[PDB]
Amino acid sequence: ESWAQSRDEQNLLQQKRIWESPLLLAAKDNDVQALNKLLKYEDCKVHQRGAMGETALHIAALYDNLEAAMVLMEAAPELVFEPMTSELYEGQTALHIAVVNQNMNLVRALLARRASVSARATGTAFRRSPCNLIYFGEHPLSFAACVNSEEIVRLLIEHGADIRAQDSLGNTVLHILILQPNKTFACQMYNLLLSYDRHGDHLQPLDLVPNHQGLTPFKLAGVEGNTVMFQHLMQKRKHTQWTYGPLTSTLYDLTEIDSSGDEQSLLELIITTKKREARQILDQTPVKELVSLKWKRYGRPYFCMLGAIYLLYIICFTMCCIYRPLKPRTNNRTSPRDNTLLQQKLLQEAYMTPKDDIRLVGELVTVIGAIIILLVEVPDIFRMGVTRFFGQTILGGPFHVLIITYAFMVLVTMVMRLISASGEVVPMSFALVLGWCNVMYFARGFQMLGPFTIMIQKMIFGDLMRFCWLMAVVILGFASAFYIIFQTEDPEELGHFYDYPMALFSTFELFLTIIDGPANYNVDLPFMYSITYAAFAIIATLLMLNLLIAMMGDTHWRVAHERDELWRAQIVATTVMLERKLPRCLWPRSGICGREYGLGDRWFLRVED
Amino acid sequence: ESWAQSRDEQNLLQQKRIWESPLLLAAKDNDVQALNKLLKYEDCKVHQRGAMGETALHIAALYDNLEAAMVLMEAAPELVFEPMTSELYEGQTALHIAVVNQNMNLVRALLARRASVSARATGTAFRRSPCNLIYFGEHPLSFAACVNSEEIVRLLIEHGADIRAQDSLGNTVLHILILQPNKTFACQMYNLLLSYDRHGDHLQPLDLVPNHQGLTPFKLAGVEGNTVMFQHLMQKRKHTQWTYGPLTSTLYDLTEIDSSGDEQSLLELIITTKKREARQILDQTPVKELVSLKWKRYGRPYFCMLGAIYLLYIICFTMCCIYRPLKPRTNNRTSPRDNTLLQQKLLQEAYMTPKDDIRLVGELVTVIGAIIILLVEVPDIFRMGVTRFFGQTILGGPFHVLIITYAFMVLVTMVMRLISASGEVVPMSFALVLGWCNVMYFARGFQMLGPFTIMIQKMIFGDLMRFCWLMAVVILGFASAFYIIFQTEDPEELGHFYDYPMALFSTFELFLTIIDGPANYNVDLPFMYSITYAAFAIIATLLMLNLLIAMMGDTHWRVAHERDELWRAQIVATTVMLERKLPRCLWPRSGICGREYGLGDRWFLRVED
Numbered sequence A, B: 001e002s003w004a005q006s007r008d009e010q011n012l013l014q015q016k017r018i019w020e021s022p023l024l025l026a027a028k029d030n031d032v033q034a035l036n037k038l039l040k041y042e043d044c045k046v047h048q049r050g051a052m053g054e055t056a057l058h059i060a061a062l063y064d065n066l067e068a069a070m071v072l073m074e075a076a077p078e079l080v081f082e083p084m085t086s087e088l089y090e091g092q093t094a095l096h097i098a099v100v101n102q103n104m105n106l107v108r109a110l111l112a113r114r115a116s117v118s119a120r121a122t123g124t125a126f127r128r129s130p131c132n133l134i135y136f137g138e139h140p141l142s143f144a145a146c147v148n149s150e151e152i153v154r155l156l157i158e159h160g161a162d163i164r165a166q167d168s169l170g171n172t173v174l175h176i177l178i179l180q181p182n183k184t185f186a187c188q189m190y191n192l193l194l195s196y197d198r199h200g201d202h203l204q205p206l207d208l209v210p211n212h213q214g215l216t217p218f219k220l221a222g223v224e225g226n227t228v229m230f231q232h233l234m235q236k237r238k239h240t241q242w243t244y245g246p247l248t249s250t251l252y253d254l255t256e257i258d259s260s261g262d263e264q265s266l267l268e269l270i271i272t273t274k275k276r277e278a279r280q281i282l283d284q285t286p287v288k289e290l291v292s293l294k295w296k297r298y299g300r301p302y303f304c305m306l307g308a309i310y311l312l313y314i315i316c317f318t319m320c321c322i323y324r325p326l327k328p329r330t331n332n333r334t335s336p337r338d339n340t341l342l343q344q345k346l347l348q349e350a351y352m353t354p355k356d357d358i359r360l361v362g363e364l365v366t367v368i369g370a371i372i373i374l375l376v377e378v379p380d381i382f383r384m385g386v387t388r389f390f391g392q393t394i395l396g397g398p399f400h401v402l403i404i405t406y407a408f409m410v411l412v413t414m415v416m417r418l419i420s421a422s423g424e425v426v427p428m429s430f431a432l433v434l435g436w437c438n439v440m441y442f443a444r445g446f447q448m449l450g451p452f453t454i455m456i457q458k459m460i461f462g463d464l465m466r467f468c469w470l471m472a473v474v475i476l477g478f479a480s481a482f483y484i485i486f487q488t489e490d491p492e493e494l495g496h497f498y499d500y501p502m503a504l505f506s507t508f509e510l511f512l513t514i515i516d517g518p519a520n521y522n523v524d525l526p527f528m529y530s531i532t533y534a535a536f537a538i539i540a541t542l543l544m545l546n547l548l549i550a551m552m553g554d555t556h557w558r559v560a561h562e563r564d565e566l567w568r569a570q571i572v573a574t575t576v577m578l579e580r581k582l583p584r585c586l587w588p589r590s591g592i593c594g595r596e597y598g599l600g601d602r603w604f605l606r607v608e609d
């Protein structure tokens, strides 16, 4: 907060550092006559700095003043070069300011006195960060491209500029147009600026030059959701084979869209980026067909063979828990509240029959399966993000967490079976619930179950969790009242609130109306019970019918319009994942390779519409 | 009703008092020739009054008649001055009527005979009240401004008018334009009328002059929801620091918008006014940023430290009720329906162990907390509205009532503990429910829980209370039938309706289907039970599914479009409250103060867009 407070103070401190001098006053407004009196009488020094360490020329450019600064140059011609020596607008010179305010006559007077066009505004007000409402780059070519000024673009190339110049982020000027809020004007700048390569000794095209994330402008249009620069960039990568009346056969280049090894690709970048406007690109004319190609041919068959193996694995795990080793209890019961008949066997006792060795096969299969789950999910964070970049992906998939939590609870049950620890029902019951509810992951490989299963996630991490805080508040208040109302009664005749953890659990069940809840009719209940439970029942059904509301504004007004789009993005995230963690010989590469067609070492996709 | 009946009779009695005289007849229509016969033959008196005590001239102005009234002035020149001597349009003269009907030639003939322009229509038809469909003021400048007549505005300033003149409410003419139903025409009158200050010896600007509620025109635009006069008035309070291409840095005056001590402010006026169109102003360009400033920096941290203290306080209170002093009962049970095992200890017995003194700390903390709740909420009605202005604020907050009802029930439990009164479970159970459901107040300081918690209030004081009247009717009829059906049976085999208060409570539970309800299958139930309960079950599920309807027209068609707006208004109401009841040294004032920037003793807000 203090940096935005410091930035708010520097703009006000700038407006005060003008008013206490005449030499910086005649170069703010159009008062040229006093400035001729300021120079010849006392012969004062003219390099007086303002708040940002700048000369009076930067105030002239920021308010469009040309006339007094001529006498500044007939007397002190060296004024052109000196940039801002500040720390917020650092390295910004007078040329940058006249570019974004689009002054043209100042360029003809500066450059006649050998001005500078390769200056780099590296200050913090020009960087790519959400505090700054503009991002233009660092160079004066970059600024004129972004305020949509064709004249200043050609006026710099005449004066020794450079279009292959980059930011500290590595963005060239072609990258920066893709980042602009005004999309259609960026398309015209892109065609204007790309048309100045004109050098064969240099090998790199300007639209192939990557920034420091290794992204081209084409891939930067994909990551940012710039769909009209995506379609515009796609004509460099089309080829029209033939036109047959209403038909045409278009061949798509597919080189930077599909994966080519260790280099990151457009399909994987759209999924693994934090931006949501990138998912509109997943419906475009080389990409929508590419995704439907590899899902219908290789993705969906493998995802169904993976879900048929997983289903048999959990059915095998379920039988090992149903047949877990149990024996009659040894000590006698300690109290009439003791319900236990059976306890689990020791390791020396639990494998002593042919019926046990059928279970040992399934137990070893279960253990082997949990290790293979931890060998393909846990080694993919130590080269990846340890808890950060894996932690970002959790909103895309909770089933990563669920299948590791399953495999954790299997191996805890293994350890407790090895050391004869008591309480194997605790890790098993988590594992039965975790392992079976992971079958819902494979719902995304079906037309019927895919868009319904996404609705489940967005209501548990939205409106269900939202309801649970308000539910916990009501439960805690009424369970405490129900506890102290029945605290003086006999629990043998009404035991719902006999101690305080049972009173919490009973009130929870009463909230959901899943237990019938306290009545005897042979005995006098306290009168406060009938008052409190009537009030509880009105509030609980009010709240329950309110959760039913919020789940209907959640779906039909937020996530029913995007059922297919969120589900098609799940097919892409699955198909990308199911190719990276699968061998090369099982997965043919998508598209048709050249070198048998005179097309190169490229893989091409044909679309006939 | 009788005053609107009296007002309806006076307009009809006015239409009859014309027809019985010739001297008031020739001055209604264009019959000038008979009027020259009415004057010279019998030489009659001309000051004959109508129904509102008015002369015949007011009938001429009300129907645009100029020609006969000239001979009225060549014979009786003193006719100009005499106002209405009525009590509904009191003090209205002929100049007011010709202004609102926009006659111009009558002004040139009256004022040539020294007419009056400082007349005050103080009658009841011109006051600000919902019976009157216009509110124009009292002065003839005020009327011409409101019917949008620029010519008559300049025609009065030439004739000795006064723009600094006020109503009996204290509204100047600039106040009255803000109150008009035609917003855009009021903006042009505002620029026309403000441009006539032109006096340096007088100190007060016309747009700074307050009415009797101490409100400027700027604050009157805030209170009334006049958003286009709010934005128009805001340009007097902006200052553009610089423009950098697409960027500009605007500095907002923020003096009459933020609080300056005991004088009432714009943020607190929007919240504490009864009007709902004022909440649109809470989204405007100096106000939306000011609110998000002090909530994100000071409001939200303090509201979370206040909710973390309150949560620990209620957890401490909950433990004191769970560990309340109880002993085995002394007398024997009086009947087999007596379920009580325990009774509470006396004061001499309830503090006799180290386990009691841990509870005495928590009980004293609970008591001290309830006094501090009553010291910051109850002394704020005796200088405020005792039950009226506090009573108006209840629709904004029920948690005022809930936290005082909590603190009332704590101290009743204190008194009953001090005097060994029996029945402490009655004030405690209210206090556990009231104290825990007050945690839902702190839901408004979160993005997730804020708009959901407002939905709860608007359905309990709307559709739930609406359903409860219809529910009580059905419950009362069927409980009485269920009572008399089972009135001849043995309640040992079916006890749901054994007496009439249990029959009411059972039918309530049966309505909500939260108890399973009567079946035995070993015994013959009355045949009327199966008829009545089938009819009850159809009606109860019909009604329950109808409550589910009404809660979906309530939200998605009334209060889902305004979830963020009702929740942002709750942030303003919380931030205003949490600054007034909090010290000065903990709360830095919002904005940047001048006097180190040449800007005055004002606090300014900078907005860069």
Ligand SMILES: CCCCCCCC/C=C/CCCCCCCC(=O)O[C@@H](COC(=O)CCCCCCCCCCCCCCC)COP(=O)([O-])OCC[N+](C)(C)C
Residues within 6 Å of the ligand: A468, A469, A472, A473, A498, A499, A500, A501, B315, B318, B319, B322, B323, B324, B439
């Ligand atoms: C996203 C989902 C939301 C989850 C919310 C979390 C809710 C879940 C919380 C669960 C807490 C469960 C533990 C309580 C019981 C422990 C067992 C025990 O022995 O206690 C004992 C008493 O102990 C107490 O009195 C503790 C209760 C005090 C108030 C609890 C509030 C704190 C929870 C923080 C929640 C704040 C969150 C509010 C949210 C805004 C029981 O007594 P006894 O042994 O039976 O008899 C004593 C005998 N004698 C008295 C006759 C001598």
Ligand SMILES: CCCCCCCC/C=C/CCCCCCCC(=O)O[C@@H](COC(=O)CCCCCCCCCCCCCCC)COP(=O)([O-])OCC[N+](C)(C)C
Residues within 6 Å of the ligand: A524, A525, A526, A527, A531, A535, A538, A539, B340, B426, B468
């Ligand atoms: C979401 C909506 C929330 C609603 C909030 C709920 C409102 C809550 C307000 C409750 C106020 C009730 C006062 C309680 C104080 C009783 C003290 C007393 O002396 O009583 C005595 C008689 O008891 C009776 O016979 C009277 C029963 C209570 C009165 C009617 C309450 C029903 C509310 C109807 C209107 C409903 C309107 C609601 C509209 C919706 C009991 O004393 P005792 O016999 O000596 O005890 C010994 C027996 N023992 C040993 C077994 C212990």
Ligand SMILES: CCCCCCCC/C=C/CCCCCCCC(=O)O[C@@H](COC(=O)CCCCCCCCCCCCCCC)COP(=O)([O-])OCC[N+](C)(C)C
Residues within 6 Å of the ligand: B468, B469, B472, B473, B498, B499, B500, B501
């Ligand atoms: C916003 C929320 C809505 C709230 C609505 C309020 C509803 C809540 C109302 C609650 C009233 C509760 C009190 C009744 C029972 C008292 C106990 C008692 O002793 O009574 C006794 C009889 O007494 C009666 O018969 C009274 C019943 C007559 C009709 C009740 C309607 C009046 C309620 C006004 C409602 C109109 C509102 C309608 C709305 C349009 C019980 O008899 P017994 O002792 O068991 O046995 C006698 C023995 N013997 C016969 C064999 C000899």
Ligand SMILES: CCCCCCCC/C=C/CCCCCCCC(=O)O[C@@H](COC(=O)CCCCCCCCCCCCCCC)COP(=O)([O-])OCC[N+](C)(C)C
Residues within 6 Å of the ligand: B524, B525, B526, B527, B531, B535, B538, B539
């Ligand atoms: C929201 C919708 C609301 C619906 C309104 C509900 C309609 C209400 C209309 C009800 C009309 C019923 C007539 C009641 C009079 C009976 C008198 C008699 O003599 O019967 C005798 C035989 O009893 C029987 O065996 C016949 C049972 C009733 C007939 C069929 C009723 C079911 C309705 C089907 C159609 C449903 C259509 C509904 C469509 C929806 C009983 O006399 P007893 O044996 O001598 O008694 C001694 C036993 N005791 C000592 C134990 C006491």
Ligand SMILES: CCCCCCCC/C=C\CCCCCCCC(=O)O[C@@H](COC(=O)CCCCCCCCCCCCCCC)COP(=O)([O-])OCC[N+](C)(C)C
Residues within 6 Å of the ligand: A309, A311, A312, A313, A315, A316, A319, A320, A323, A355, A356, A357, A358, A359, A360, A361, A362, A363, A365
């Ligand atoms: C997709 C849906 C269809 C799929 C088809 C399968 C689903 C449904 C199939 C069968 C279910 C119905 C048959 C009941 C089971 C009885 C088996 C038995 O003989 O019990 C024996 C022990 O039992 C065990 O030891 C098995 C425990 C787990 C082993 C898991 C299989 C391992 C084999 C390798 C597989 C590798 C896994 C592959 C890895 C990827 C003997 O005990 P008993 O005392 O004689 O008990 C019978 C008497 N009683 C009941 C009266 C007490």
Ligand SMILES: CCCCCCCC/C=C\CCCCCCCC(=O)O[C@@H](COC(=O)CCCCCCCCCCCCCCC)COP(=O)([O-])OCC[N+](C)(C)C
Residues within 6 Å of the ligand: B309, B311, B312, B313, B315, B316, B319, B320, B323, B355, B356, B357, B358, B359, B360, B361, B362, B363, B365
């Ligand atoms: C936010 C969520 C986390 C917060 C953490 C806290 C939440 C959870 C924390 C603890 C809950 C779980 C522990 C159980 C409680 C046992 C304590 C005990 O020793 O009992 C004793 C008496 O007990 C009392 O006297 C306490 C009664 C209320 C005192 C309130 C605290 C005052 C201390 C100052 C605080 C100032 C408050 C601050 C003001 C703003 C001994 O009785 P006993 O007979 O030996 O009982 C045990 C045997 N039995 C059960 C088998 C019968």
Ligand SMILES: CC(C)CCC[C@@H](C)[C@H]1CC[C@H]2[C@@H]3CC=C4C[C@@H](OC(=O)CCC(=O)O)CC[C@]4(C)[C@H]3CC[C@]12C
Residues within 6 Å of the ligand: A306, A309, A310, A313, A365, A366, A368, A369, A370, A372, A373, A376, A377, A396, A397, A398, A399, A400, A401, A403, A441
């Ligand atoms: C003795 C043998 C035959 C045991 C059988 C083992 C298989 C049933 C297990 C072993 C490893 C498992 C895989 C390990 C990890 C994953 C990643 C997992 O990814 C997610 O959960 C994605 C998260 C999301 O996006 O929601 C999908 C299932 C899969 C392929 C698992 C499918 C089931 C496998 C093949």
Ligand SMILES: CC(C)CCC[C@@H](C)[C@H]1CC[C@H]2[C@@H]3CC=C4C[C@@H](OC(=O)CCC(=O)O)CC[C@]4(C)[C@H]3CC[C@]12C
Residues within 6 Å of the ligand: A396, A398, A399, A429, A430, A433, A434, A437, A438, A440, A453, A454, A455, A456, A457, A458, A460
């Ligand atoms: C032994 C008992 C107490 C188990 C309790 C453990 C819970 C923490 C588990 C049980 C089932 C789990 C759920 C089962 C299924 C899913 C998958 C997923 O839900 C979806 O809708 C899938 C996401 C998608 O479709 O993209 C998000 C997590 C969730 C709700 C799980 C969250 C964790 C849960 C609630």
Ligand SMILES: CC(C)CCC[C@@H](C)[C@H]1CC[C@H]2[C@@H]3CC=C4C[C@@H](OC(=O)CCC(=O)O)CC[C@]4(C)[C@H]3CC[C@]12C
Residues within 6 Å of the ligand: A468, A469, A471, A472, A475, A501, A502, A504, A505, A508
């Ligand atoms: C509000 C939403 C988000 C769900 C939270 C509801 C809570 C009130 C639930 C969640 C877990 C429940 C607990 C889960 C396990 C148990 C153990 C259970 O049995 C025992 O403690 C041991 C057996 C005995 O001696 O009775 C008693 C209830 C209790 C504390 C439950 C009390 C009610 C709890 C706290």
Ligand SMILES: CC(C)CCC[C@@H](C)[C@H]1CC[C@H]2[C@@H]3CC=C4C[C@@H](OC(=O)CCC(=O)O)CC[C@]4(C)[C@H]3CC[C@]12C
Residues within 6 Å of the ligand: B306, B309, B310, B313, B365, B366, B368, B369, B370, B372, B373, B374, B376, B377, B396, B397, B398, B399, B400, B401, B403, B441
């Ligand atoms: C021994 C000590 C530490 C006991 C602890 C005392 C606090 C937990 C209490 C004492 C006074 C209470 C305050 C008294 C009154 C109010 C006003 C209250 O305002 C409303 O209820 C607004 C109503 C609405 O608009 O809905 C908000 C909570 C607050 C600050 C209370 C918060 C909790 C406080 C600080």
Ligand SMILES: CC(C)CCC[C@@H](C)[C@H]1CC[C@H]2[C@@H]3CC=C4C[C@@H](OC(=O)CCC(=O)O)CC[C@]4(C)[C@H]3CC[C@]12C
Residues within 6 Å of the ligand: A531, A532, A535, A536, A539, B396, B398, B399, B402, B429, B430, B433, B434, B437, B438, B440, B453, B454, B455, B456, B457, B458, B460
């Ligand atoms: C022992 C029993 C019989 C007590 C009788 C009634 C109680 C259950 C009290 C304590 C909790 C109270 C509720 C707690 C929260 C609120 C605040 C408010 O609800 C909201 O949605 C908050 C307002 C907002 O968000 O602006 C309206 C009153 C209400 C429902 C209260 C109404 C009265 C209640 C139900």
Ligand SMILES: CC(C)CCC[C@@H](C)[C@H]1CC[C@H]2[C@@H]3CC=C4C[C@@H](OC(=O)CCC(=O)O)CC[C@]4(C)[C@H]3CC[C@]12C
Residues within 6 Å of the ligand: A524, A525, A526, A527, A528, A530, A531, A534, B468, B469, B471, B472, B475, B501, B502, B504, B505, B508
């Ligand atoms: C219609 C909506 C708005 C709620 C109102 C429903 C009523 C039918 C409820 C509200 C309060 C209830 C009462 C709350 C307290 C009691 C005390 C309860 O126990 C006793 O009277 C003492 C013990 C005994 O001797 O049985 C019997 C039911 C009764 C009258 C309840 C009967 C049903 C009532 C009137």
Ligand SMILES: [Ca+2]
Residues within 6 Å of the ligand: A515, A516, B515, B516
């Ligand atoms: Ca039941």
